[PDB]
Design a protein around this ligand. Structure first.
Ligand SMILES: NC(=O)C1=CN([C@@H]2O[C@H](COP(=O)(O)OP(=O)(O)OC[C@H]3O[C@@H](n4cnc5c(N)ncnc54)[C@H](O)[C@@H]3O)[C@@H](O)[C@H]2O)C=CC1
Lengths: 338, 335
């Protein structure tokens, strides 16, 4: 009934993707997938391949994607096929869910925290032109129209997911004009939903507080200055790029991915990779499709196969393969019907 | 002899702690005199904001400084007092040591980490301007030169302070030119000395690999393109902002020592600050000044105080006044 654009990408990514579709098979989830097999390391890539992606996004309007692997030995990142895709969907608003999982102990347990960052400019507008013999210059852009966007999204997400506080992590102190503007917008939109606490934090301090006690926060909205760092810093509290889901929204789309996507996010081999991130992001995708029943089941299954402690991948402290950890989940998915 | 050194009280909990750290030196009778030189934002003739001439001639007379944190307005006034201060002295290196306090336990143990971050380029110094309505452009520039200058400092620090590894934190994935250069300058000096072992991690990986396990990191070197979000992160492993020191080492032995902990408005004038920051800051001064045994006396005093537990201040887990703290540490030193 329900088509979902699926982009495996490269890395261990295509393996996780499999796991999501195999677990969907176990649960009988009325989602059917169009895979777009797009990548630059394997040279299945052109913008005619991107167009086919967006011809897919027009219809289904909802897609789960991996990470496409930019070849940094020739290109950069703002010309990656991944940035070039992100663009075509006018994706903004990265949503990262930092939520510890009961039964995976860390130094930051029982944590519930969602990181909204602007995904269209800031570091991703880096213009770099050489000016001298060896003087590099770096030009970055901030816009009221892309910020009034990120905070309305943020607040509209706070209200929509039950959450009561919203912090705006900002560098007004030195970036008096770029992040002054961002604060001004945030402060502007902040009166409009008066059922929601709002507060501002200098970013410098916040990364200290984010690891001295993350429990003080709830919704964090920030401009894309400094990059995707804070997504990755928080995502360590909860046990890593193996478990922290992520989603990227549009005016009209929703791309569901992983929260922490650094280079060498999962530099594992055959098997031996965790699929908790993809799976917890699949169910979140499922919730978006209003298949809440099937979202409950997948989600509540793999939040418990990892509480019971019998199977565990490399990164969570355990020995099992990925095939083994995904096959453990099928068993407990197939049980949950009756 | 009896050396002298500039002192900027600072704003907010500047006086509280600068008084406190003055008095531990007093109590310990260290051969230091304090030349107090309030440096406030002062307009410039051409509009280029200068320094209070009091502090500008005073520092050249001592080539040394301990400083409280200065106040920068949220969106309404001076670019920053600290940035101008670091730049008009060419303190091209902001060393942030970051070690545990044996007696004060966190969720992290045995963390000895040092951030060597460059201090005069990148987002520190640049135009940010209004290009059209609702659109702002910012023009942060990095150089070939100071890149090399901090990446030499990196291996020199790791050479004096007997360090295993030096790792270059960079974001050459998303900023090819800017930070691709810096690596090249790191790479060049790292070949000069296989003495020190070297690598390159991307910034997002490190912040993740960090909250997971700060046992993999020795010295870190960074362009000032991502400010110091790492250095404040690492200041979450130790204890608090109240306990981390910081150093604006420069060339020719000039240096201003301050702490990461900032203006602290919440507890301004409330007498619940932490003097441990500005203190261990000044314990870098002495150890930078060659006064090694006033150093280990005062330093090891402040530790043994913290370990005893009966006077540790409000942000450390005890209702204890910044004053009563500073005299348990004072009394502790004297015998
Ligand atoms: N070294 C410098 O020049 C710095 C200057 N600043 C400026 O000063 C103001 C400070 O802003 P914030 O970042 O919010 O303040 P801050 O970074 O000094 O943080 C103080 C807050 O953090 C805690 N804290 C920090 N240091 C503490 C200490 N020594 N003892 C007890 N608690 C401590 C308290 O909870 C307090 O509310 C800003 O305008 C900022 O630009 C901020 C950081 C460094």
């Amino acid at each position: 009934s329900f088509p979902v654009t699926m982009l495996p990408g490269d890395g261990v990514g295509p393996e996780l993707m499999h796991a999501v579709k195999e677990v969907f098979k176990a649960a009988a989830v009325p989602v059917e997938f169009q895979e777009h097999h797009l990548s630059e390391v394997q040279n299945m890539a052109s913008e005619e391949k991107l167009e086919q992606v967006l011809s897919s996004m027009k219809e289904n309007k909802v897609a789960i994607i991996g990470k496409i692997h930019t070849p940094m030995e020739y290109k950069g990142e703002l010309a990656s096929y991944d940035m070039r895709l992100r663009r075509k969907l006018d994706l903004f608003a990265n949503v990262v869910h930092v939520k510890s999982l009961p039964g995976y102990m860390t130094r930051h347990n029982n944590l519930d925290l969602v990181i909204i960052r602007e995904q269209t400019e800031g570091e991703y507008s880096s213009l770099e032109h050489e000016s001298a013999r060896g003087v590099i210059e770096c030009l970055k852009i901030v816009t009221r129209a892309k910020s009034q966007r990120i905070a309305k999204f943020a607040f509209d997400y706070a209200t929509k997911k039950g959450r009561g506080k919203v912090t705006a992590v900002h560098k007004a102190n030195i970036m008096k004009l770029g992040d002054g503007l961002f604060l001004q917008c945030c402060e502007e939109v902040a009166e409009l939903y008066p059922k929601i606490k709002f507060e501002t934090m200098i970013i410098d301090n916040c990364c200290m507080q984010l690891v001295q006690n993350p429990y003080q926060f709830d919704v964090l909205v920030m401009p894309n200055l400094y990059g995707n760092i804070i997504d990755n810093l928080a995502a360590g509290l909860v046990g890593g790029a193996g478990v922290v889901p992520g989603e990227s929204y549009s005016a009209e789309y929703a791309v569901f991915e992983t929260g922490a996507r650094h280079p060498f996010a999962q530099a594992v081999g055959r098997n031996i990779a965790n699929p908790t991130a993809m799976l917890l992001s699949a169910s979140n995708m499922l919730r978006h499709l209003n298949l809440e029943y099937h979202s409950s089941m997948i989600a509540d299954a793999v939040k418990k196969v990892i509480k019971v402690g019998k199977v565990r991948t490399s990164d969570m402290g355990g020995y099992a393969t990925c095939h083994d950890f995904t096959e453990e989940i099928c068993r407990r998915v197939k049980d949950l019907d009756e | 002899g009896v050396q002298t050194v500039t002192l900027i009280p600072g704003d907010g909990i500047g006086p509280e702690i600068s008084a406190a750290v003055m008095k531990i030196f007093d109590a310990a009778k260290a051969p230091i005199q304090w030349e107090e030189r309030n440096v406030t934002a002062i307009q410039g003739p051409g509009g280029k904001w200068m320094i209070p001439s009091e502090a500008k001639e005073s520092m050249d007379k001592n080539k040394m400084g301990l400083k409280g944190p200065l106040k920068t307005p949220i969106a309404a006034g001076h670019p920053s007092m600290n940035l101008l201060l670091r730049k008009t002295f060419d303190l091209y290196a902001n060393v942030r040591p970051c070690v545990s306090i044996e007696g004060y336990k966190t969720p992290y143990t045995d963390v000895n980490i040092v951030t060597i971050r460059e201090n005069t380029e990148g987002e520190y110094s640049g135009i940010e301007h209004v290009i059209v309505d609702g659109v702002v452009q910012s023009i942060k520039l990095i150089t070939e030169g100071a890149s090399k200058r901090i990446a030499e400092f990196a291996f020199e620090y790791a050479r004096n302070n007997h360090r295993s590894n030096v790792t270059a934190v960079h974001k050459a994935n998303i900023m090819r030119m800017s930070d691709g250069l810096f690596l090249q300058k790191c790479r060049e000096v790292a070949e000069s000395c296989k003495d020190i072992k070297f690598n390159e991690m991307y910034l997002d990986t490190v912040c993740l690999n960090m909250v997971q396990d700060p046992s993999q990191f020795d010295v870190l070197v960074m362009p000032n393109l991502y400010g110091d979000i790492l250095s404040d992160l690492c200041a979450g492993l130790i204890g608090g902002l109240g306990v981390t020191p910081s150093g604006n080492i420069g060339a020719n032995g000039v240096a201003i020592f301050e702490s990461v902990h900032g203006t602290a408005p919440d507890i301004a004038g409330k007498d619940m600050a932490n003097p441990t920051a500005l203190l261990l800051s000044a314990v870098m001064m002495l150890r930078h000044m060659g006064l090694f045994d006033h150093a280990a006396r005062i330093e090891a005093a402040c530790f043994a105080t913290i370990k005893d537990g009966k006077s540790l201040t409000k942000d450390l887990g005890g209702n204890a006044k910044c004053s009563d703290f500073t005299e348990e540490i004072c009394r502790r030193v004297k015998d």
